[PDB]
Amino acid sequence: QCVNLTTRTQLPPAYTNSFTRGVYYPDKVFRSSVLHSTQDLFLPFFSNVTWFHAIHKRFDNPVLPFNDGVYFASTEKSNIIRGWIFGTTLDSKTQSLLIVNNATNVVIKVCEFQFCNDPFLGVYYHKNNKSWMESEFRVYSSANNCTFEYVSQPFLMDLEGKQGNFKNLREFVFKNIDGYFKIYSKHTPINLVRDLPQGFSALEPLVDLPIGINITRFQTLLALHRSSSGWTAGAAAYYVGYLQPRTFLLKYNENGTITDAVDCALDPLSETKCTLKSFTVEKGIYQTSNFRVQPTESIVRFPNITNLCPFGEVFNATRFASVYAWNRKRISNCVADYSVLYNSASFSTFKCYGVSPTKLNDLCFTNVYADSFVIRGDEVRQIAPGQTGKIADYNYKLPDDFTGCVIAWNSNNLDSKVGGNYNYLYRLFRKSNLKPFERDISTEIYQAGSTPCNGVEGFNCYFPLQSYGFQPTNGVGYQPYRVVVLSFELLHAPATVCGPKKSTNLVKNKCVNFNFNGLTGTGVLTESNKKFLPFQQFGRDIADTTDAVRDPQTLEILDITPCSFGGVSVITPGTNTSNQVAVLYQDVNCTEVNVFQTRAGCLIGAEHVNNSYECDIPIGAGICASYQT
Amino acid sequence: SNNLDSKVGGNYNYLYRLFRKSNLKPFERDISTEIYQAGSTPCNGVEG
Amino acid sequence: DIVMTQSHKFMSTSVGHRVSITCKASQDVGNDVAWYQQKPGQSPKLLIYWASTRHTGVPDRFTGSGSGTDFTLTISNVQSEDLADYFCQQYNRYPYTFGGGTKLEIKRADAAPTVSIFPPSSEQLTSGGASVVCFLNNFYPKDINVKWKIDGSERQNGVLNSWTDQDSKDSTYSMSSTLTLTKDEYERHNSYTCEATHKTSTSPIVKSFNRNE
Amino acid sequence: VQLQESGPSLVKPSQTLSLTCSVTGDSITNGYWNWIRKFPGNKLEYMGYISYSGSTYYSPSLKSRISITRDTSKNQHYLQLNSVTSEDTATYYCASDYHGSKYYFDYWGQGTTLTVSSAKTTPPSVYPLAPGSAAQTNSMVTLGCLVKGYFPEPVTVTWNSGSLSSGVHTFPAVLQSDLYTLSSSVTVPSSTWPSETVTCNVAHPASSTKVDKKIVPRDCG
């Protein structure tokens, strides 16, 4: 339960190469004398795997993931590796798939196991008359809520701790396909010391149990043998690899056994075998794949610098509306400049709820409403959500999910007119609380206490509708203030006002993603000498394809060329002759990808010789390749 | 089974899952009692 | 309603370090970020309004910025008088309630707690009363849990908890918990154990006494 | 701008509550002045708001049991609560919410404590405590005394008339439904007891009752 081992010696993290291993049957379909291809979670060839041992100086049991493919190839000498541990989090919170082996049966239980930091098995009492008997069981602590149990056939496992070179090889592939856990097994005798044989081995399915759990991490159950923290293991080594959904070509004999497999996505010589569907490829040039340049960045040079919003009729208008019967205006399809007001340092209160005004230049919205009225000096704090006053309780209440702006500035020299300004009214009393975006034009007498007013004024009875009034000889709290209340929202319409940083440029000589006014895709811009008309924004060729655009800010004409693409050809020799490669990337130079440029494309792998010979393998433009000394 | 599974005070030993993030696969079961995403809006851990 | 999810509710910094209190809002707030400072034994005070300008009278060591949903208060060179509970206030709707609170603490050395158990005196047993009070003082920090054990069972009803703040002499804490019982409720029990759990070791302090003496 | 809270120490139930918050430096003519109370245990509660018109709205928990008035000539505002009970026992505070000169001003006062309960003036009962002989051995010996059933808070709780300071820890009262309690202790080393005189000194000036329970092995000669 809490027993840990301290007999682990530090080793450098080396790796092991896999030449032609990691091929199993994708299904239960009998195929004979055919060359068919399949695509499933197989091991890619010429890859590097991890380095773990299960011996008496290295004893490792890490926590490795499961979703990135699991390839378990291990050599066994003294029967140390017994089973495997699967599960989501490997604790009591989620389910776990536990496979144990007590040298009599392969016990598979699906319960809520609680594992420790290093599960193992105990083979102890090796002083005298040992006979390799099991002593302890330290896999898990407890289990509850079991759902499945599988008992295999009984057998006799030799628990003798033999040393020396390995004589057995066991390969396993674990995966989960919609809850059905499939286990592949293959056993073949080998003769090596440390590494794995660089040959071929086809794995066969053994069991298929409908577990139905999610597996994200997995471990490996090991044993201990020595002739509670000082015990050592026997002689074993396991290498864990990752599977990738690649294309593999399988060869079937008359008996249906897979004899050879070639990974298609490894080298261009292997791409010819999967295209022609033949393991024996003669001398010639064949199509292998298709080349495509991957873009790096993605800029959107869609909007221009014109079409500014006329904010002079909203902030500096001649007359606003009332605070209880206001008229909401819609302003869209323009560019609202809000940075010249925050940096002016002349506003009394410049705040914006939802999005800060420093972030409004880099934030997109659908539209923006307007709500302009004239308030007093003490009513600046009243136009705010979650507040009170003569406006927030009687005239206009802001909602909790407010995404607009509260803009305030001193307008003592603006609202001062000859004879006074009495064109604005406000409510002073109300019978109940307010609602968000609610108007009120009633003139009913408010009743404060239990005494009725009977429609006339008196004790705690006043008229709700009052008029504004200000004097220049008053204090700060009685000055008129012009305020503009905004309202941002998101609709099904696209964004019309965001603010494109008041400046736009154009990047050329690079295949990247672009989003223009009449073309969206990947391309690389080059210099040109064309002259566009002042109303045109983009140009097309005779093929009705946009290949020339215009900068919306700079008066320059730059044509856009799309990124290079085309088929990939190779020059392949005979199967029993050589395995050299010469990749030919068509419709591209030798810079965007034995270097020689042709009219068909860049050829990498062939040395340019000035001497002329007979054309063996044709390429194009009078250039051919051959195999000479 | 009203006269078979009931008891004094009510039997609260039977539970069921009402909402889930995704639909269940064919022949799939789960005994987890943790809080997951209910519908289009996730709970993000605790219920909220 | 927008609830400010506080990332830290209890921080232990020293004099001269930087205090980082992050209140991640569930929705977009913008200028709807308010910082209050409530000193122990004093009144609260608005410190940072709208995440742009500090209050008049606040020195230049208190500042803050942020946008969207990520807001972090920046307190550089925190002195000894800055030990207070910081709240993140929202202006969504009424009432004007406060959040959880982030209390700062001067980082000192930890100490083992001492739990004392007092049996009832002869004056209460003659009249018919009983009193079992478990004191706990001279410990650090204040995140020390005290569990009641009445004959092996935990009792929470009738327990009067009383916690104290950080002392100004040696930066220690103290707490106490009493239980009002009678003469018939005192002799019916036989086991009574008050323990304390600290972060220095997994072994708690064992303290108990026999009811029958 | 500096505020100041004031009020009585104890308030009898079924009466009219009275509070006074004076605003110095600026007369109350523009802005908003609130009343925020705080329960003992770091829990604040917002009751209601008062507008410039005079009509006030409150929380649904206190519909017609709270009245807020103001006066522009005395530069202060009052708070009145009708039909008080044990739920109104909190630490009240006053604040100022107004704008001006492109700044957000929010000034607070000191604070006042008003304790309302159904219990009348009850004299305290001091019981000195002593550790028994059937306890677990320890290097530290603690002395203490428990006082329960008194009203109101706060009181003067010390040890040896303030001359004792070795391990003296004074705990505040616990908010119950009717009355309050006390808690105090003194931690001394094992070489100090019983060479030093330890006396439980708990005073109650509201009812003119002062009981000093010295630790004496009763009865003596």
Structure tokens at B19: 């909402």
- A503: three-class secondary structure by DSSP: coil
Q: Does A27 touch chain B (CB under 8 A)?
A: no
DSSP characters over A68-100: T-EEEEEEESSS----EEEESSSSSSS-EEEEE
Structure tokens at A566: 């085309």
Alpha-carbon dihedral A126, A132, A135, A139, rounded to 10 degrees: 120
CA–CA separation, C162 and C146 (whole Å): 12
CA–CA separation, A196 and A190 (whole Å): 9
Q: What phi and psi, each to the nearest 5 degrees, are found at residue A506?
A: -140, 130
Q: Does C190 touch chain D (CB under 8 A)?
A: no
- Start-to-end CA distance of chain A, whole Å, equals 68
CA–CA separation, C212 and A401 (whole Å): 64
Q: What phi and psi, each to the nearest 5 degrees, are found at residue C71?
A: -130, 130
CA–CA separation, D63 and D81 (whole Å): 11
Q: Using CB atoms, which residue from A93, A95, A179 is nearest to B27?
A: A179
User: What single letter denotes the amino acid at residue A620?
Assistant: G
CA-nearest residue to D31 within chain A is A378
Structure tokens at C169: 């002499």
Mutant choice from C38, C54, C118, C183 vs D, greatest count of D C-beta within 10 A: C118
Q: What angle do CA A250, A254, A260 make, to 5 degrees?
A: 30
Element housing D24 (H / E): strand D19-24
Contacts 24+ apart (CB under 8 A), A594-601: A596/A623, A598/A623, A601/A566
CA–CA separation, A423 and A213 (whole Å): 73
CA–CA separation, A306 and A329 (whole Å): 22
Nearest Cα neighbor of A446 from D57, C62, D206, D94 is D57
C-alpha radius of gyration, chain C, whole number: 22
Interface chains of chain A (3 or more CB pairs under 8 Å): B, C, D
Check CB contact under 8 Å for A212 and B29: yes
Q: What phi and psi, each to the nearest 5 degrees, are found at residue A479?
A: -85, 150
Cis before D124? omega within 30: no
Q: What phi and psi, each to the nearest 5 degrees, are found at residue C124?
A: -80, -35
Nearest Cα neighbor of C193 from C180, C206, C184, C202 is C206
DSSP state of C51: T
Provide CB contacts within 8 A for A27, sequence distance 6+. Answer: none
Nearest Cα neighbor of D172 from D154, D150, D199 is D154
Separation of CA A332 from chain center? 34
Q: Using CB atoms, which residue from C121, C178, C213 is nearest to D183?
A: C178
User: What single letter denotes the amino acid at residue A207?
Assistant: V
Cis before D123? omega within 30: no
Expressed as residue numbers, the domain containing A83 is: 15-290
Check CB contact under 8 Å for B29 and A93: no
- Start-to-end CA distance of chain C, whole Å, equals 58
Pairing of strands D10-11, D112-116: parallel
In angstroms, this model's resolution equals 5.9
Provide, as residue numbers in chain C, all residues whose Cβ is less than 8 Å from the Cβ of A380: none
Give the CATH number of the domain where residue A179 resides: 2.60.120.960
Q: Using CB atoms, which residue from A349, A378, A390 is nearest to D53?
A: A390
Please list the alpha-helical segments (H only) found in chain D.
none
Q: What angle do CA A305, A306, A311 make, to 5 degrees?
A: 115
CA–CA separation, A40 and A20 (whole Å): 16
Provide CB contacts within 8 A for D216, sequence distance 6+. Answer: none
Interface chains of chain D (3 or more CB pairs under 8 Å): A, C
Question: Cβ(C69)–Cβ(C3) under 8 Å?
Answer: no
Provide, as residue numbers in chain B, all residues whose Cβ is less than 8 Å from the Cβ of A94: 32
Burial A65-81 (b: 16+ CB within 10 A, else e): ebeebbbbbbbbbbbbb
Alpha-carbon dihedral A591, A594, A596, A601, rounded to 10 degrees: -70
Provide CB contacts within 8 A for A432, sequence distance 6+. Answer: none
Q: Does D64 touch chain A (CB under 8 A)?
A: no
User: What single letter denotes the amino acid at residue A124?
Assistant: Y
Question: Cβ(A26)–Cβ(A40) under 8 Å?
Answer: yes
Q: Does D74 touch chain C (CB under 8 A)?
A: no
Nearest Cα neighbor of C73 from C57, C55, C87, C58 is C87
CA atoms within 13 A on the CB side of C18: 7
CA-nearest residue to B25 within chain A is A178
Structure tokens at A92: 């009591």
CA–CA separation, C83 and D2 (whole Å): 22
CA–CA separation, A21 and A39 (whole Å): 16
Chains B and A: 3 or more CB pairs within 8 Å of each other: yes
User: What single letter denotes the amino acid at residue D70?
Assistant: R
Alpha-carbon dihedral A571, A575, A580, A581, rounded to 10 degrees: 30
Provide CB contacts within 8 A for D87, sequence distance 6+. Answer: none
Separation of CA C17 from chain center? 22
Provide, as residue numbers in chain C, all residues whose Cβ is less than 8 Å from the Cβ of A365: none
Provide, as residue numbers in chain B, all residues whose Cβ is less than 8 Å from the Cβ of A178: 25-28
C-alpha radius of gyration, chain A, whole number: 40
Provide, as residue numbers in chain A, all residues whose Cβ is less than 8 Å from the Cβ of D52: 378, 389-390
Question: Cβ(C167)–Cβ(C107) under 8 Å?
Answer: no
Tell me the CA distances in angstroms from D21 to A387, A389, D28, one per residue in order.
Answer: 21, 20, 11
CA–CA separation, C194 and C178 (whole Å): 11
Q: Does B34 touch chain A (CB under 8 A)?
A: yes
CA–CA separation, A281 and A418 (whole Å): 100
Nearest Cα neighbor of C121 from D124, D157, D218, D190 is D218
Provide CB contacts within 8 A for C196, sequence distance 6+. Answer: C113, C115, C136, C139, C144, C145, C146, C204, C205
Beta strands in chain C (DSSP E): 4-6, 10-13, 18-25, 34-38, 44-49, 53-54, 62-67, 70-76, 85-89, 102-106, 114-118, 129-131, 133-139, 145-150, 159-163, 173-182, 192-197
Check CB contact under 8 Å for A147 and B31: yes
Burial D160-191 (b: 16+ CB within 10 A, else e): beeebeebbbebbbbbbeebbbbbbbbbbeee
Structure tokens at A492: 């099904």
Structure tokens at A67: 């979703």
Burial A305-321 (b: 16+ CB within 10 A, else e): eeeebebeebeeeeebb
Provide CB contacts within 8 A for D141, sequence distance 6+. Answer: D131, D188, D189, D190, D192, D193
d(CA D198, nearest CA chain C) in Å:
15
Burial class of A244 by CB neighbour count within 10 A (0 to 12, 13 to 18, 19+): middle
In SS3 terms, A172-218 reads as EEEEEECCEEEEEEEEECCCECCCCCCCEEEEEEEEEEECCCCCCEE
Neighbours of A582 (CB within 10 A): 21
User: What single letter denotes the amino acid at residue C65?
Assistant: S
Chains C and D: 3 or more CB pairs within 8 Å of each other: yes
Which residue's structure tokens are 């700079």?
A554
Q: How many A×B Cβ pairs under 8 Å?
A: 20
CA–CA separation, A238 and A76 (whole Å): 9
CA–CA separation, D172 and D177 (whole Å): 16
d(CA A381, nearest CA chain D) in Å:
6
Neighbours of A403 (CB within 10 A): 20
DSSP state of A238: E
Neighbours of A111 (CB within 10 A): 19
CA–CA separation, A581 and A603 (whole Å): 11
DSSP state of B25: P
Q: Solved how? A: cryo-EM
Check CB contact under 8 Å for A354 and C30: yes
Q: What angle do CA D82, D86, D87 make, to 5 degrees?
A: 80
Q: How many C×D Cβ pairs under 8 Å?
A: 131
Q: Does B26 touch chain A (CB under 8 A)?
A: yes
